[PDB]
Each structure stands twice: as structure tokens, then as C-alpha cells.
């Protein structure tokens, strides 16, 4: 973090980058099947349930 988000601009953009990578991982995970519970996705993404619902 001393050389990743140290730049204020990268600090601003890290939230968007995390949102994008989480969206990509979620989409890849839910492509092969259907009707999947939310808490399993939250545990896989290592984030809160509300964030998973919003995404």
C-alpha cells in the first residue's frame, strides 16, 4: 500500500478497480450455472453480503 495507493489518484481509482475485478470474478463464477445462493458468493469474494447484492 505504500507504493500501490500512495498516489492520491491511484487511491481514488482503487475503489473502481476493486469493483471491476470483483464484477469480473462474480460474472466468471456465475457463468457456468444458475440459481446460486448469495452467502456462498460473499464467502468466495471475501466481501460483505450487502456489497454482493449491490454488485
Amino acid at each position: 500500500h505504500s507504493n500501490i495507493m500512495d498516489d492520491p489518484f491511484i487511491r481514488e481509482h482503487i475503489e473502481e478497480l476493486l469493483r471491476n475485478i470483483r464484477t469480473q470474478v462474480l460474472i466468471k463464477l456465475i457463468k457456468p450455472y444458475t440459481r446460486i445462493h448469495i452467502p456462498f458468493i460473499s464467502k468466495e469474494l471475501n466481501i460483505d453480503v450487502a456489497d454482493v447484492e449491490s454488485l
Binding site: 457456468p32 450455472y33 440459481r35 446460486i36
Partner: protein, 270 residues
């Protein structure tokens, strides 16, 4: 000095072979790249055969078990290669195919390898016979194959729960897709002798890669492998029924020519 293409090819081949037992892919990958770059300039046929053998070894080592099997199978039907060396290359192809990611390409390679009689000569003949003729794999065939591979596992070990067991689980899920229309998490895990979470994860991975068709429902814990509506199932059953009728009629005519004479007499009377 403007070294001729043969000398550069030999040097890069030697470096690549040395790096395979030193276990350092990055630089040997680049050296195989350059050896391929200058490869379509050389003349010597034996040098080309040695290069192809080394390239197949590299493919087997990295993760490219299917591509290594393809290259070894291509090299197996050669003449200048020693019969012992040809048999060794075919054995490498067979082991790579068994260890390969179980999919359409691996199924085609298994079908192709079920033709060589020197495949039947090998001790893994039974193994690929089981693979291609479709069955479920237990944990007792693991020992002999693991011993054969590289006194441990092929390439450079595996440690990914063994590539042997990865392939066993993949082929087991393929065989399940052959029979099981759908399966629950607990019963599938019991069949594969693994926890249900591992079974569902491996099934999802296989579905994502396109090697196993189906979809997974997480509420009921049921993975619907295959559902062929109602027409394809009915059509194949009728076609199989008619084919078995034709097989029977041929068998009576061949094994009992007197029946054919009786059949001609019966049809002429009426």
C-alpha cells in the same frame, strides 16, 4: 561466425534438455521459442526428430499434457526412431493422455491410442481401456500409475492433489455425465470419495472449461449433468432397437443358413 542452422539448433536443443533436469522453465521456454524460430531452416532429419522429442518433453513438463500427447503420437508412427524409443514415446503419449485434462480432445486422443497394438503391449493398456470404454475409477489403480509416471508424478511431480487424482476425478465426472442425468452434492462427493464442496467446485470448473456439460443449482444441491429432452432419447432407442433387429436377422442367416432356406421356403409358400 555465422554458425550454420544445424549448430545453433543443436546448441539450443542441448540447453533446453539441460534445463529440463535443472527444472527452470522460463529460460528453457524462451530457448525452445528460439529453437523453433530457427528450426524451419535446418536440414538434418535425425536432428529434427530429436528436436520434436525434446519439444514434446517440454510440453509434457509445463502443463501441456494434451499437446505433448499429440506430439508423441505424431512421433510414434515414425521409422528411423528406434522401436524401443518409439515404444517409449508412445508410452509417454499414453501417460500424458491419461494425465491430460479430461475433455473432447483427451477423448479423441484416447480413441486414437486405442488402435496401436504396441499400446496393448504396454502395462497402461488396461488403464486407457478403462478410460475409453467408460468406467468409474477407484483409489487402487493410483499406486501403479504413480509408480510408473516418474517414481511420483509426470513432468516434475504434481502436488495439485496429484495430477493422477485430478485426471481421475475429471474422468469420473465424465462417466457420471454419461450415466447420471443429475446428482446431489453429498452423493456425488461420496461417489468421488471427496467432500461435497470439492465435488461442486470441480464440477463447476469442468463446466466452465466446457469439458463437462450441465448446470449446478445451489439451493437443492443438485447438478443436472445431461437432459436430452424427449426426442433424441426416443430416436436413439428406436435406432438401437432396429439395429439390434438387423443384427439378429444377420446372425440367424449366417449361423443358421438352414433358416435362410426355411425362410425362402416359407415366403414362397405364402
Amino acid at each position: 561466425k555465422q554458425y550454420n542452422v544445424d549448430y545453433k539448433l543443436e546448441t539450443y536443443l542441448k540447453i533446453a534438455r539441460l534445463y529440463l533436469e535443472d527444472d527452470d522453465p522460463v529460460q528453457a521456454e524462451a530457448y525452445i521459442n528460439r529453437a523453433s524460430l530457427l528450426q524451419n531452416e535446418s536440414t538434418n532429419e535425425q536432428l529434427q526428430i530429436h528436436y520434436k522429442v525434446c519439444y514434446a518433453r517440454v510440453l509434457d513438463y509445463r502443463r501441456k499434457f494434451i499437446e505433448a500427447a499429440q506430439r508423441y503420437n505424431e512421433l510414434s508412427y515414425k521409422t528411423i526412431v528406434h522401436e524401443s524409443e518409439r515404444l517409449e514415446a508412445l508410452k509417454h503419449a499414453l501417460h500424458c493422455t491419461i494425465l491430460a485434462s479430461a475433455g473432447q480432445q483427451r477423448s479423441r486422443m484416447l480413441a486414437t491410442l486405442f488402435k496401436d497394438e504396441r499400446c496393448q503391449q504396454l502395462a497402461a493398456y488396461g488403464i486407457l481401456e478403462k478410460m475409453y470404454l467408460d468406467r468409474i475409477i477407484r483409489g487402487n489403480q493410483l499406486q501403479e500409475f504413480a509408480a510408473m509416471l516418474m517414481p511420483h508424478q509426470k513432468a516434475t511431480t504434481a502436488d495439485g492433489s496429484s495430477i493422477l487424482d485430478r485426471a481421475v476425478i475429471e474422468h469420473n465426472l465424465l462417466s457420471a455425465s454419461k450415466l447420471y442425468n443429475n446428482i446431489t452434492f453429498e452423493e456425488l462427493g461420496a461417489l468421488l470419495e471427496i467432500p461435497a464442496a470439492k465435488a461442486e467446485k470441480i464440477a463447476s470448473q469442468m463446466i466452465t472449461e466446457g469439458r463437462m456439460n450441465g448446470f449446478i443449482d445451489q439451493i437443492d444441491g443438485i447438478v443436472h449433468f445431461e437432459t436430452r429432452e424427449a426426442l433424441p432419447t426416443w430416436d436413439k432407442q428406436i435406432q438401437s432397437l432396429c439395429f439390434q433387429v438387423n443384427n439378429l436377422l444377420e446372425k440367424i442367416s449366417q449361423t443358421a443358413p438352414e433358416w435362410t432356406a426355411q425362410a425362402m421356403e416359407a415366403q414362397m409358400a405364402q
